[PDB]
Design an enzyme around this catalytic site. Structure first.
Site, mmCIF file in Angstrom:
data_model
loop_
_atom_site.group_PDB
_atom_site.id
_atom_site.type_symbol
_atom_site.label_atom_id
_atom_site.label_comp_id
_atom_site.label_asym_id
_atom_site.label_seq_id
_atom_site.Cartn_x
_atom_site.Cartn_y
_atom_site.Cartn_z
ATOM 1 C CG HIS A 89 -1.516 -1.404 1.499
ATOM 2 N ND1 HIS A 89 -2.657 -1.332 0.355
ATOM 3 C CD2 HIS A 89 -2.185 -2.534 2.043
ATOM 4 C CE1 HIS A 89 -3.480 -2.525 0.608
ATOM 5 N NE2 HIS A 89 -3.061 -3.064 1.850
ATOM 6 C CG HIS B 148 -5.297 -0.871 -3.199
ATOM 7 N ND1 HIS B 148 -4.452 -1.480 -2.150
ATOM 8 C CD2 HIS B 148 -6.205 -2.214 -4.054
ATOM 9 C CE1 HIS B 148 -4.073 -2.515 -2.197
ATOM 10 N NE2 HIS B 148 -4.465 -3.348 -3.316
ATOM 11 C CB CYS C 243 -3.849 3.168 -1.104
ATOM 12 S SG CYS C 243 -2.881 2.121 -1.620
HETATM 13 CU CU LIG Z 1 -3.155 -0.269 -0.747
#
Ligand SMILES: [Cu+]
Length: 102
Positions: free
Chosen positions: A37, A90, A87
């Site tokens: 991440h 994501h 992030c």
């Molecule tokens: Cu992430």
């Protein structure tokens, strides 16, 4: 303050996803689990140049991920206000949070 980035189960979440700090207080984002991440602050259209510079410095590069190797990242935001971060990989999976600076 401390924020957990991800979990051992594989959810795309920050824990907690809302935190309040004092001006100058570092937020340390530390990876949890095997999924990589990162953390990057949204820069509002509107923000003064000084605040934009702070937020960029408080952000990872989008070519940078936390790992078991580099597990954490420290962000310092001086300007009182509320800021959103996300992030990079994501972002579309709604992996985001808020920072309030008192
Ligand atoms: Cu992430």
């Amino acid at each position: 303050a401390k924020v957990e980035v991800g979990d051992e189960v594989g959810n795309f979440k920050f824990y907690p996803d809302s935190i309040t700090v004092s001006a100058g207080e570092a937020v340390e984002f530390t990876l949890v689990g095997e999924t990589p991440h990162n953390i990057v602050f949204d820069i509002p259209a509107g923000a003064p140049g000084t605040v934009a510079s702070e937020l960029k410095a408080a952000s990872m590069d989008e070519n940078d991920l936390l790992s078991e190797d580099e597990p954490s990242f420290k962000a310092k935001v001086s300007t009182p206000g509320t800021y959103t971060f996300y992030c990079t990989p994501h972002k579309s999976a709604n992996m985001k949070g808020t920072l309030t600076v008192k």
